Specification:
Largest interface: A-B, 52 and 52 residues
GO biological process, one term (chains A, B, C, D): antibacterial humoral response
CATH architecture of chain A: Beta Barrel
Largest sheet of chain A: 8 strands, antiparallel, barrel
Oligomer: homotetramer
CATH class of chain A: Mainly Beta
CATH topology of chain A: Lipocalin
Number of strands of chain A: 8
Number of domains of chain A: 1
Organism (chains A, B, C, D): Gallus gallus (Chicken)
Subunit structure (chains A, B, C, D): Homotetramer.
Subcellular location (chains A, B, C, D): Secreted
Protein name (chains A, B, C, D): Avidin
Helix content of chain A: under 10%
Structural class of chain A: mainly beta
Strand content of chain A: over 45%
Distance between the termini of chain A: 17 Å
Bound molecules: 1-desthiobiotinylpyrene, 2-acetamido-2-deoxy-beta-D-glucopyranose
């Protein structure tokens, strides 16, 4: 019932487009963040992920990686597709944003965490 | 070159194998977890990710999704490949483990967080 | 301007009451969660925290621990008090919920993560 | 068996001293981080927390807030006191570091996450 393919926007105004989900739960897309910590121009960035198919849930868990094109960083998102009380779909996700550090001693400070809620455009 | 390709084990005893990293930073592999939250007999599970290639860092950031084959869950990992003080490679990662819940009202409890350190086998 | 003292509710329906913040940034209160992971019954539970006072910010960062009275668990929250575009106050927080485990080998699964948004009652 | 009172060091070299745990599980102490991202001199900073006393566990969960004296930030830690195979105590903790941001629109980027392991000094 709750399918990742298509166009989504989040609570921060960011957009993503996810393509077809193949029989193995794999998908690809693009991500346009509306926000950045960096002082660079934001670029559309590719994403790759999977959606869990065990017991063929109508509201499956999923995960994807966003490989940013304007920074040395990587973000991963994980969450679940729900059908809220109206029949409306909603992705409830959490993410980790990993920055690059030069030295292994700075590893401790390299990872940020937050949430995003996506709905269809 | 701190390279993701090859065989890795973590501090919990889990194993992963990552294949070739193509010119777009994409890779695939398999994951055998040594631990679970789940009711089930553990199965080798596929993973898909990307390694960031901006400025071609010798210690790049990366992310990957593990699409578990014995549970309704998904885990995402993100981190960075370092060359420690010996010349040994080490992946420092953090993860988010998303469980499935039946009801959107239980979403709050569905996400666990932790770390793992990988070294070569 | 944005003061922790008083009564707050969150997006999950939980309530908290925070007493006076002394000259060291310390405060105490109580927390009544509207949600829990088990069927044991919920009890009002104490909280203890501090609010950062460096540069006496009108929107300071803060942290508090909730010492649950119906579980072996502990939750910590950290966040910042903002004055949104209207003059309304809002606490943006993240939390870590640590469960007890009885073997150190299960430590990996003991920590959950999420967010909460509080506004005044 | 596993008591928070005393002097502890972590895997990054940071030290903390925790005072008596009163009958309500409350404790106070001081934290000297060995690392910082800020361009300031590190200062000893106060901590306030609680240890969970439900069922009087010999290895309880706990939480504490560190009110930093050289930045506008706050850190919270949560974890559990274990007695390792040898009768060694160990604190396994996770933390959230909340930075101050000027604008609520930057909230998303204000929270970092990690772990620490403490042992007695
Ligand atoms: C995951 C969050 N949710 C969104 O929709 N967008 C957010 C990600 C921010 C964009 C990443 C690049 C960046 O700002 C930076 C130092 C990095 C680093 C820096
Ligand atoms: C992320 C951690 N690191 C590992 O090596 N394995 C851990 C995750 C394995 C969980 C298996 C699926 C599951 O429990 C579901 C609920
Ligand atoms: C921070 C969130 N926002 C809010 O407003 N409230 C939320 C916190 C939930 C309240 C914690 C008590 C709890 O869920 C538990 C209550 C009771 C439990 C009993 C056994 C348990 C075993 C293993 C893990 C457990 C985790 C949690 C248990 C529990 C566990
Ligand atoms: C919890 C960890 N384990 C320990 O033993 N000590 C660690 C805590 C570090 C001390 C916090 C002060 C700090 O470095 C910061 C304090 C304040 C900050 C404000 C803005 C920031 C933006 C980007 C990166 C930042 C990094 C660090 C910032 C900071 C940052
Ligand atoms: C998101 O999509 C909407 C509608 O397609 C568009 O108007 C908006 O500008 C997009 N936002 C970003 C950040 O690209
Ligand atoms: C990981 O590989 C090691 C060494 O090859 C092996 O002994 C171990 O059983 C593997 N772990 C799992 C969980 O299969
Ligand atoms: C919090 O306060 C509101 C309004 O006073 C009340 O209706 C609600 O049930 C309270 N929630 C809990 C969990 O006590
Ligand atoms: C921690 O304590 C040890 C032993 O007393 C000391 O040698 C070390 O410098 C301390 N570290 C910090 C950051 O204060």
């Amino acid at each position: 019932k709750c399918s990742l393919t298509g166009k989504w926007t989040n609570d921060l105004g960011s957009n993503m487009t996810i393509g077809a989900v193949n029989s193995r739960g794999e998908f690809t897309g693009t991500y346009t963040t509306a926000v950045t910590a960096t002082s660079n121009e934001i670029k559309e960035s590719p994403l790759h992920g999977t959606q869990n198919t065990i017991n063929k849930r109508t509201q499956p868990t999923f995960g994807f990686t966003v490989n940013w094109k304007f920074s040395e960083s990587t973000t991963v998102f994980t969450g679940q597709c729900f059908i809220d009380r109206n029949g409306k779909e909603v992705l409830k996700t959490m993410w980790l944003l990993r920055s690059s550090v030069n030295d292994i001693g700075d590893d401790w400070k390299a990872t940020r965490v937050g949430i995003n809620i996506f709905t269809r455009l």
